[PDB]
Design a protein around this ligand. Sequence first.
Ligand code: HEM
Ligand SMILES: [C-]#N
Ligand SMILES: [Cl-]
Ligand SMILES: [Cl-]
Ligand SMILES: [Mg+2]
Length: 153
Amino acid sequence: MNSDEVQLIKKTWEIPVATPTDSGAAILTQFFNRFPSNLEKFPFRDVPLEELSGNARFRAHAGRIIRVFDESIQVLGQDGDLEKLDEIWTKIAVSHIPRTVSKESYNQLKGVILDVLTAASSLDESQAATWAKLVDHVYGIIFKAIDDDGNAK
Ligand code: HEM
Ligand SMILES: [C-]#N
Ligand SMILES: [Cl-]
Ligand SMILES: [Cl-]
Ligand SMILES: [Mg+2]
């Protein structure tokens, strides 16, 4: 993406990153409510959906997923940002391989993340398309590490 696109992503990210736990909670809540198969991968799998948003593990995990995005967005536009993104997102792919996270499951979360960010930052259609470019980019990095079922390629 170009400099203007990088600008727009940094600027609009300011809103959801202001509240990392809440933003990550929105992502996770919507993910699990729409695609609960994925909840079985997590150690809090047995916590009822009604109690999940108050669970300490869920809340801390919310921050963890936002931190990855924040680190990624900070490096955007830096010299060697492509290589730095490759490192960040290959590390994500490798840590999820033992969890057998399928491409289908990654793509389920992809749509949720874009929906949550579109809402949070009141993105219009052109701004949302810019975000989709970034997310498609980092997904390409994940997907080159894995087969369709989430095993090492
Ligand atoms: C954008 C995609 C994703 C991001 C950035 C992401 C990020 C993270 C991070 C930062 C962690 C904690 C550190 C680590 O283990 O490396 C983690 C843990 C985890 N992720 Fe993901 N993840 C993604 C997608 C997924 C998907 C699609 C699933 C499918 C269920 C998943 C399942 C898990 C599991 C089960 C854990 C362990 C959670 C815990 O022990 O509390 N992740 N993820
Ligand atoms: C992973 N959340
Ligand atoms: Cl927060
Ligand atoms: Cl499901
Ligand atoms: Mg501002």
